[PDB]
Amino acid sequence: SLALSLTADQMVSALLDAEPPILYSEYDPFSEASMMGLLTNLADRELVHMINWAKRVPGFVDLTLHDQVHLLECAWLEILMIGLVWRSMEHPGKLLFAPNLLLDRNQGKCVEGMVEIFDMLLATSSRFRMMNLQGEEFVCLKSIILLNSGVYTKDHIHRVLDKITDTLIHLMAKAGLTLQQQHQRLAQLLLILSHIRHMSNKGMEHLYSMKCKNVVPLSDLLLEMLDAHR
Amino acid sequence: SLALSLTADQMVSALLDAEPPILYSEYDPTRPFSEASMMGLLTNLADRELVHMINWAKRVPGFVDLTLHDQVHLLECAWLEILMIGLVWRSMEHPGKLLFAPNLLLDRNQGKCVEGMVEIFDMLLATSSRFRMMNLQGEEFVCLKSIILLNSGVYTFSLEEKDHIHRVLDKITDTLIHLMAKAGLTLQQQHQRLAQLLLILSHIRHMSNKGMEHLYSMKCKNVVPLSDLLLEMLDAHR
Amino acid sequence: KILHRLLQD
Amino acid sequence: KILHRLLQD
Numbered sequence: 001s002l003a004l005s006l007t008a009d010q011m012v013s014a015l016l017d018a019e020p021p022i023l024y025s026e027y028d029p030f031s032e033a034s035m036m037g038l039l040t041n042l043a044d045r046e047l048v049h050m051i052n053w054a055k056r057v058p059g060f061v062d063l064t065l066h067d068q069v070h071l072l073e074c075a076w077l078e079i080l081m082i083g084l085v086w087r088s089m090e091h092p093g094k095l096l097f098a099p100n101l102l103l104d105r106n107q108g109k110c111v112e113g114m115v116e117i118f119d120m121l122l123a124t125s126s127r128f129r130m131m132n133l134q135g136e137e138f139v140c141l142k143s144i145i146l147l148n149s150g151v152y153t154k155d156h157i158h159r160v161l162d163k164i165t166d167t168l169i170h171l172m173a174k175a176g177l178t179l180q181q182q183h184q185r186l187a188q189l190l191l192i193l194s195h196i197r198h199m200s201n202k203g204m205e206h207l208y209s210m211k212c213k214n215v216v217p218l219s220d221l222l223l224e225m226l227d228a229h230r
Numbered sequence: 231s232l233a234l235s236l237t238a239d240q241m242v243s244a245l246l247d248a249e250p251p252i253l254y255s256e257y258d259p260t261r262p263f264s265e266a267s268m269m270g271l272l273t274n275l276a277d278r279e280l281v282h283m284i285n286w287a288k289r290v291p292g293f294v295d296l297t298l299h300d301q302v303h304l305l306e307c308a309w310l311e312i313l314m315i316g317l318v319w320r321s322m323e324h325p326g327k328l329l330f331a332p333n334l335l336l337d338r339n340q341g342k343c344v345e346g347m348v349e350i351f352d353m354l355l356a357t358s359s360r361f362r363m364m365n366l367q368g369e370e371f372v373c374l375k376s377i378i379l380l381n382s383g384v385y386t387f388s389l390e391e392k393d394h395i396h397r398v399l400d401k402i403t404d405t406l407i408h409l410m411a412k413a414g415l416t417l418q419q420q421h422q423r424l425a426q427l428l429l430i431l432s433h434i435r436h437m438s439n440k441g442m443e444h445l446y447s448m449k450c451k452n453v454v455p456l457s458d459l460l461l462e463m464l465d466a467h468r
Numbered sequence: 469k470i471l472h473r474l475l476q477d
Numbered sequence: 478k479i480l481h482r483l484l485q486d
């Protein structure tokens with residue numbers, strides 16, 4: 001397993017180099033069917049890139065095929081959310097779904113029951129801004145989500161999770177933080193994952209509500225990921 | 231604030247002495263369990279545990295220093311998380327079993343009843359198996375449970391709200407590190423264990439959400455009717 | 469409100 | 478499932 005033999009600097013560079021591209025939404029006031037239409041198309045395309053990104057996460061390739069499936073099925077919405085939150089960081093009060101799709105919570109109300117998650121998403125972004133979350137920390141958290149979210153449903157996964165913790169502390173040691181400041185912010189970072197988990201679960205509930213209402217015929221891939229949560 | 235004045239040793243002591251008691255169930259093993267009976271026992275048990283938890287929360291350092299509609303908010307968000315991590319903790323020395331009460335020890339085949347709870351049971355067991363694997367300490371448990379109380383609802387919040395909450399959360403972090411440092415753990419081992427412990431909270435949040443949805447299912451299902459307090463906490467997920 | 473009594477009671 | 482095919486290429 002090469003993931004464990006990597007220095008934390010190599011781990012950082014490896015994660016950075018695996019970062020998926022920022023996709024665009026299709027171009028051109030929204031209803032609830034049109035807004036959901038854009039988001040569904042975008043989310044489905046982001047999924048494809050995420051799955052290929054996961055194969056480039058150090059140690060994920062070492063897992064068996066259906067263990068990779070389990071972790072991706074459990075954490076796909078979390079990963080999509082923390083991604084949305086990260087690129088929306090420099091746009092306070094707004095969520096940057098795409099460079100040509102920047103929305104505020106007032107526009108989030110067009111879709112029923114979406115405004116709750118938006119505020120939670122916006123609150124997560126404001127927290128990242130407050131902590132001045134760095135890109136190297138973000139990619140560490142995202143891969144942590146990928147490995148941790150479904151691991152409790154294994155030693156090698158905990159093996160890799162420890163090295164990312166070492167990678168995090170290493171990064172924060174580079175930024176001139178004292179020992180105390182290092183496990184404090186480390187704790188702060190990891191506690192965010194509890195909220196992201198909460199958003200995902202409430203987000204999962206909202207999409208299943210959109211399936212049984214059938215306004216947008218969800219993607220078969222998106223349906224497979226959604227039906228996986230039961 | 232005196233919670234910020236507490237040494238990490240004083241932090242543990244305050245948390246240890248504030249622990250709730252292990253309540254007993256009205257369980258009668260003379261009869262084989264059903265669904266309404268089992269659900270009735272658990273509901274009765276959880277409700278009485280809620281009362282103690284509410285009084286436990288008031289003793290958590292820093293919690294008393296907040297307004298009502300904040301304590302209310304934190305408890306509304308974290309109550310099931312706290313009930314679950316408490317259950318998991320007292321079930322630690324019983325592999326493949328959940329100790330709801332000293333006289334109510336259940337495995338995953340009796341939990342296979344009540345419809346859709348057996349999945350949650352397996353998750354509760356997997357967490358207990360994880361605590362056993364890490365050999366979780368009581369000093370670490372009381373910290374984690376206090377972290378859950380203050381953290382789970384802080385993100386759903388003018389007058390400097392959370393700077394005090396996050397600051398108490400920062401000292402509980404220092405307390406955990408203290409604890410590991412005395413256990414003989416190296417600095418690298420301290421950070422790692424700190425991470426492993428806090429990642430559990432993510433899974434605990436997940437169980438709570440699933441459990442929350444499962445409880446909402448149960449009395450539109452109209453089996454054994456809930457305590458009025460549980461229904462209050464349950465309608466906070468809206 | 470029960471959890472509204474137990475907090476100050 | 479679709480996830481299968483995407484993880485194999």
Ligand SMILES: Cc1cc(O)ccc1C1=CS(=O)(=O)C=C1c1ccc(O)cc1C
Nearest residue numbers: 039040042043046080081084114117203
């Ligand atoms: C996942 C999803 C699927 C769908 O079909 C409709 C909407 C959402 C969605 C709901 S939300 O939670 O508001 C954010 C997203 C979202 C959408 C597109 C993205 O590229 C990323 C995200 C995180």
Ligand SMILES: Cc1cc(O)ccc1C1=CS(=O)(=O)C=C1c1ccc(O)cc1C
Nearest residue numbers: 272273275276279313314317347350441
């Ligand atoms: C919370 C709950 C409420 C209810 O009315 C019926 C059942 C449960 C429950 C279902 S579960 O998630 O299997 C575990 C519990 C549970 C029960 C009693 C406890 O003292 C603690 C817990 C955590």
